[model samples]
Target: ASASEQETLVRPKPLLLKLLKSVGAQKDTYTMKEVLYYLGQYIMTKRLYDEKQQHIVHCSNDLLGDLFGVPSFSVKEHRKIYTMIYRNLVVVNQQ
Candidate 1:
């Protein structure tokens, strides 16, 4: 049971660690679900979406630009966002 519990908790990658603090993450390790919530809230709350398309999300600042390696991203990009987030989260190697 303890092992199962450990598998769920995870550490943050280099850049995501910064986002963690900025978002005021409550826990040391968070599942992908919570991470998305925090980021989503920040984006919408910050007015990062384009007024034209409304589906296209833009980077409001340089931090997001650098993190995403793009000036902006489309709604479809969220599929790949999961992959990028995978890099930011330190997954257990089953040690």
Candidate 2:
């Protein structure tokens, strides 16, 4: 391959990359509840606080599902989790 071809292209850091790398996207299955638990950990540690951050997480969640062939299965529940996280962070930061 040429030098240009051999070089790796830059990529945006999706929020789910770390989790997917650590736990892998391939498996028997993943339930919404289970993924939410994982997301909770990510949120807590990362301390995501802003609307932009929340949006990235929300978008990444979709990407994760698409990649893993796992359906969110509950839009209402997912929205609740995002709202909960966002509110908790805002309150914690006094925003």
Candidate 3:
């Protein structure tokens, strides 16, 4: 909302855009915080968390597999995944 906040937004790549919108998050661009919040919400809705090990996550679908850089219903830490989100966006400068 201020000049100090002007540069903190990024545009999502096509796949990331689709996924984010599929979860009804935001529009063409967003802050990293927004991405994280919406992504966390989506994972919850998809029930991707392992039944016994709630901290872990399952691949569940190919879209998730590509997002997490894995294949199949693979198990993952489910944490430290913000880097993947970073990979899906490009920093934007409002000119």
- The lDDT leader among the candidates is 3
TM-score of 2: 0.29
TM-score of each: 0.71, 0.29, 0.74
Q: Model 1, which residues run further than 4 Å from truth? A: 1-8, 93-95
Best-to-worst ranking by TM-score: 3, 1, 2
Off by over 4 Å in 3: 1-7, 71-80
| Model 1: ten consecutive residues of lowest lDDT | 1-10
Write the residue-wise lDDT of candidate 1 on 1-95 in tens digits.
Answer: 22553245566776776776676676666656667777776676677887889878788465665676667787677777776667777764423
Assess the local accuracy of residue 52 in candidate 1 as a C-alpha lDDT between 0 and 100: 83
Better of 1 and 2 by TM-score: 1
How does candidate 1 fare on TM-score? 0.71
Kindly indicate the candidate among 1 and 3 with the higher lDDT: 3
CA-lDDT, candidates in order: 0.68, 0.39, 0.70
Clashing pairs in 3: none
Residues 1-95 of candidate 3: C-alpha lDDT, one tens digit per residue: 32553337888888888888888875897876787677767777887776787766666364766876754332353354756667788888664
